Amino acid sequence: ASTSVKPIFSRDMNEAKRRVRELYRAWYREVPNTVHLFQLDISVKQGRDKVREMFKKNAHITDPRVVDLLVIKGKMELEETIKVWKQRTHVMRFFHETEAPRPKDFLSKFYVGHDP
C-alpha cells in the first residue's frame, strides 16, 4: 500500500549486498592497472585502502533501493577509470593532497573561527 515501491534491481538486502561485493572485487582488481596507467605517485596499498574507505562510509544503509543507486554510481565511476575518460587530476581528487588538515576538536575549531 504505502510501503510498496517499485525496485531498481534488487528486491531485498541479500540481492543488494550481492551486487556490492561484485562491485568491490571489480574495483579491487582495477587499482593496480590505474596506478600504472595514469602514472600515479600513490602506492597500490593506498589505492585499495581508499577504495575500502569509500565502501565503509555507506555501511549503515538498509534501503535496497538506495543501495542499488550507490552501486550504479559505483559502476559509472569504474567505467570512467578503466576507459581513461578521467585524467590524473580526477583520480587524485579522492585524496585531497592540497587541503590543510581541518581541526576536529572543540578547542582548535574555537580558535580559528565561528564554525562548529
Partner: protein, 339 residues
C-alpha cells in the same frame, strides 16, 4: 594597535590569514614553494625580484586577486629593501647562489645581503624574521660556500636577536640540484666519486617538509630567537644514495673512484662557464661533506612536521629521466643505523 590583522575565512584562497610576508629570493627553488603555501591561505606576499618580470610569471597564479605584489630591489641598495619590508610583519630571506659571479661572491650573498636585510628589518619594526642557513655551516670547512654560511648565520643573530634560523640538509624535489645532479652525470659516462662515496654520509630532506616548517615557524610564538635543523629520517652513504638514483631512472650505473685533487681540477674547468656552471669546486666539496649530526637543536618534529622518506618521493623527481613510459621494482638503499 596596528597589527594582528585578525584572520577571517576558512583558510582558503579567498580567506585572510593575517600574514604580510616579504619573501626575498622568491623566484628560485625554495621560494617557489613558500609563496605557494602562503598564498594558499590568503596571505599578502611582497615579492622583490632582480630577474626579468617574465621569470616571475609562475608565481602569479599562486594567490588571489591582489595578494601577490611585485617590486624591484637591488642587493646593494638599502632603500629598495626599505620599501619592500616596511609594511610587512614577517621577513623571509632565501637569497643564495651555488656559484660566484663577476659581481656577487659568497661573501656578498651569504654575509652582506642577509645583514642588510636584517638591519633594515629591525629599523622598520618587523617582528618576525626567518633566515635560511646550511646544516653543514662551519668556519673550518673546505667549501667557501659553507664558510660564509657560518659567518652570515652569526652576523644575522646579532643584528636581529629574535630571528629564527633554519638549517636544512640537502633538499630534494622536482626543481632540485641534488637528485637532478646525480642524474646528468650520465652525460659523461661513468660517475666519479671521491673515495667511491663510501666515506660520505648524506641526510636528504624533502622540499615540502622544509616549506611546512617555515610556515609553522611564522605562527609559532616559541620559535623566536631559536635555531632549528631540518633533516630527513634516514642517513645514506653517498655511494648507495647515488646508486638508488640511477636505479629509479633505469640508467646504467658505472662508478669509478677519483682522487680529491683530480676532482677539483675538473671542477676548475667547469667554472669557466659564463653561465650557470654545471659543477664547481664548491659543489664537489659540499656533495662530499658528510652531513653534521646536531642533536642539541630542535628538528622538524618540534614544528609538527612528519619527515617524508626519500623513497616515497624519489619517483616523482626522477620520472622525467627515464627513457620509457610504462616500463612495467627498485629496492631501497641501505640506511645507516642511528647511533
Amino acid at each position: 594597535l596596528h597589527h594582528a590583522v585578525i584572520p577571517h575565512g576558512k583558510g582558503g584562497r579567498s580567506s585572510v590569514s593575517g600574514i604580510v610576508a616579504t619573501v626575498f629570493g622568491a623566484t628560485g627553488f625554495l621560494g617557489r614553494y613558500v609563496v605557494n603555501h602562503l598564498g594558499r591561505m590568503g596571505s599578502q606576499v611582497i615579492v622583490p625580484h632582480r630577474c626579468e618580470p617574465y621569470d616571475t610569471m609562475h608565481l602569479r597564479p599562486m594567490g588571489d586577486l591582489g595578494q601577490i605584489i611585485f617590486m624591484d630591489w637591488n642587493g646593494r641598495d638599502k632603500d629598495s629593501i626599505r620599501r619592500a619590508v616596511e609594511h610587512s610583519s614577517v621577513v623571509i630571506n632565501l637569497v643564495g647562489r651555488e656559484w660566484e659571479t663577476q659581481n656577487f661572491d659568497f661573501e656578498d650573498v651569504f654575509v652582506k645581503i642577509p645583514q642588510a636585510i636584517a638591519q633594515v628589518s629591525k629599523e622598520a619594526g618587523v617582528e618576525k624574521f626567518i633566515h635560511i642557513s646550511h646544516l653543514n655551516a662551519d668556519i673550518k670547512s673546505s667549501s667557501k660556500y659553507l664558510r660564509s654560511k657560518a659567518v652570515g648565520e652569526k652576523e644575522v643573530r646579532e643584528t636581529f636577536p629574535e630571528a629564527t634560523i633554519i638549517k636544512p640538509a640537502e633538499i630534494f624535489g622536482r626543481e632540485d640540484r641534488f637528485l637532478n645532479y646525480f642524474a646528468n652525470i650520465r652525460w659523461f659516462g661513468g660517475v666519479p666519486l671521491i673515495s667511491l662515496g663510501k666515506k660520505t654520509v648524506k641526510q636528504p630532506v624533502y622540499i615540502v617538509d622544509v616549506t611546512k616548517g617555515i610556515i609553522n615557524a611564522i605562527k609559532d610564538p616559541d620559535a623566536r630567537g631559536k635555531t632549528f635543523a631540518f633533516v630527513g629520517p634516514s642517513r645514506y652513504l653517498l655511494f648507495d644514495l647515488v646508486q638508488y638514483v640511477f636505479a629509479v631512472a633505469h640508467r646504467p650505473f658505472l662508478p669509478y673512484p677519483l682522487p680529491h685533487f683530480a676532482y677539483r681540477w675538473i671542477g676548475r674547468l667547469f667554472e669557466i662557464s659564463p653561465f650557470e656552471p654545471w659543477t664547481t669546486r664548491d659543489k664537489v666539496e659540499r656533495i662530499h661533506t658528510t652531513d653534521k649530526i646536531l642533536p642539541h637543536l630542535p628538528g622538524l618534529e618540534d614544528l609538527g612536521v612528519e619527515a617524508t622518506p626519500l623513497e616515497l618521493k624519489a619517483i616523482e623527481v626522477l620520472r622525467r629521466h627515464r627513457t620509457y613510459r610504462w616500463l612495467s621494482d627498485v629496492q631501497p638503499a641501505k640506511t645507516i643505523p642511528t647511533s
